Amino acid sequence: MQIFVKTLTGKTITLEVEPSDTIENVKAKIQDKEGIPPDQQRLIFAGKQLEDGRTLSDYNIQKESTLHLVLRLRGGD
Amino acid sequence: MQIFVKTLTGKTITLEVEPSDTIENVKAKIQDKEGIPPDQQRLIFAGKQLEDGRTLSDYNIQRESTLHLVLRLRGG
Amino acid sequence: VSESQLKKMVSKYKYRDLTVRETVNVITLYKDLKPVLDSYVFNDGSSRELMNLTGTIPVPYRGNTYNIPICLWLLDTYPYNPPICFVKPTSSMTIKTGKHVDANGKIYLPYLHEWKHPQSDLLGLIQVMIVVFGDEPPVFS
């Protein structure tokens, strides 16, 4: 399925994952598209922080879903 | 308390739940009235998707409240 | 917080500037209100990342000040369209459905029905909400 990821700057990214995909895996995909270290990425869905030990189906994430990405340490510019 | 649930066809259903009722439970009640599998039901309140691990009071759902039901397996 | 971060959450808004300014003019008077970027899933199921103003507004009643929590939603184009207000009641609050509030929390005020943009703004909308809520409390401990 396809999902969307919005940033704090106002940028939407499209990724193709599977219901059996782990959160950690999703972070890697974003690190290859933007280059943001997984240790510096915070995913949020429905106001809930996703774990790197859980999958997408565990959060009941369907296709066309939108996720929020938060950077730690305040990367800024 | 009593609540209302509108569909995509224009049908309103009345249900009697409690502030301590979980959303999974609400889905079951609708499956016994309409027969819609919980895995094929999407509840929405105030533009927010309710979870099956949360309750009604968690969303601050009072009485005479209206909820939206969405069916899955039609488009994407 | 910060004006820069505000212009970032509303980068996908047809009318950023306007929105921003208006927002800045709001949080300025009501510090109890802060902007936030979240996904708004309509009843049709569709979803969209919009910027709403979550917080509480002072509404004097019976000599007592009640900080009624609200949530204004702005659509990619809130410069001409009225925001989607909502009374987020706490576990210690009970919505008192009336003429400007239903069972879902939705707010109803002439300011929304007759929204334009040249004279209608958030500040004006909030001020009007305090006046109406003052005479008609949408909630009660």
Side-chain angles (χ1 to χ4, degrees):
Chain A
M1 54 174 72
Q2 66 185 67
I3 314 294
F4 298 94
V5 16
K6 306 299 184 63
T7 199
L8 274 86
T9 302
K11 194 176 182 179
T12 187
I13 302 170
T14 179
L15 358 294
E16 286 173 337
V17 104
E18 289 71 26
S20 188
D21 269 282
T22 169
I23 281 283
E24 190 277 333
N25 182 64
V26 117
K27 293 171 72 181
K29 97 203 174 283
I30 278 280
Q31 293 148 220
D32 195 358
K33 257 286 183 180
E34 301 294 340
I36 304 170
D39 289 346
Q40 301 172 236
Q41 293 199 79
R42 257 80 191 170
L43 312 324
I44 127 179
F45 180 81
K48 180 64 169 63
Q49 181 180 52
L50 307 114
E51 201 65 24
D52 63 357
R54 300 293 188 183
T55 66
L56 90 77
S57 182
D58 289 347
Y59 286 85
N60 304 310
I61 262 94
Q62 67 190 18
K63 329 99 108 279
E64 219 178 340
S65 295
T66 300
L67 264 74
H68 181 212
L69 263 64
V70 177
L71 326 98
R72 215 197 72 189
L73 104 102
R74 303 181 184 81
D77 60 0
Chain B
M1 63 181 181
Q2 64 183 305
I3 315 296
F4 145 51
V5 179
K6 210 167 70 179
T7 353
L8 200 72
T9 177
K11 181 167 65 179
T12 284
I13 300 170
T14 57
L15 56 115
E16 182 178 0
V17 295
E18 298 178 357
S20 61
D21 195 24
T22 179
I23 119 81
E24 181 63 20
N25 179 263
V26 332
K27 280 178 150 60
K29 289 280 284 185
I30 296 170
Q31 171 174 246
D32 290 346
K33 293 180 180 180
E34 297 297 330
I36 3 174
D39 194 2
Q40 79 126 280
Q41 280 187 98
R42 232 73 168 178
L43 267 288
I44 279 104
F45 215 144
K48 302 296 188 296
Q49 44 151 62
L50 199 65
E51 293 177 351
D52 299 313
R54 301 290 184 275
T55 66
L56 297 175
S57 183
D58 190 61
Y59 162 78
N60 312 119
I61 144 172
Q62 303 302 303
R63 67 192 298 275
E64 292 175 350
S65 259
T66 83
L67 280 93
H68 219 257
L69 172 62
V70 204
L71 276 74
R72 224 79 266 175
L73 217 311
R74 184 176 180 177
Chain C
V1 89
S2 202
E3 293 178 353
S4 61
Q5 299 302 315
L6 251 163
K7 294 190 292 297
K8 284 203 295 181
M9 302 162 60
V10 305
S11 296
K12 218 83 195 299
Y13 273 80
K14 182 169 71 67
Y15 81 123
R16 303 192 299 170
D17 29 286
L18 266 163
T19 221
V20 172
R21 216 79 151 80
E22 209 69 70
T23 299
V24 171
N25 294 120
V26 172
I27 61 172
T28 32
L29 180 61
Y30 293 88
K31 281 200 251 272
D32 33 56
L33 223 74
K34 299 96 77 184
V36 294
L37 63 107
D38 201 8
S39 175
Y40 189 80
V41 310
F42 209 67
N43 284 342
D44 194 1
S46 297
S47 309
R48 184 174 295 174
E49 185 67 16
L50 302 177
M51 193 200 82
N52 49 90
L53 311 105
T54 299
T56 183
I57 301 301
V59 186
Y61 180 77
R62 206 176 75 263
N64 195 35
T65 183
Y66 210 77
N67 63 352
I68 177 263
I70 217 85
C71 302
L72 308 106
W73 248 268
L74 312 178
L75 204 93
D76 38 272
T77 308
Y78 147 59
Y80 198 70
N81 299 337
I84 311 304
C85 289
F86 252 109
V87 308
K88 196 135 283 176
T90 66
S91 184
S92 60
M93 294 175 183
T94 301
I95 254 292
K96 267 190 148 70
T97 75
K99 295 180 180 180
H100 57 67
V101 127
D102 212 40
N104 262 13
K106 188 170 67 178
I107 290 93
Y108 179 78
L109 296 172
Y111 265 42
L112 175 137
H113 180 71
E114 191 65 21
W115 47 259
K116 298 156 269 196
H117 151 58
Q119 74 188 72
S120 62
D121 43 35
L122 258 143
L123 46 110
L125 180 62
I126 57 173
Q127 290 172 336
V128 104
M129 287 168 69
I130 295 170
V131 172
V132 58
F133 294 159
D135 198 10
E136 186 179 358
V139 300
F140 180 80
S141 267

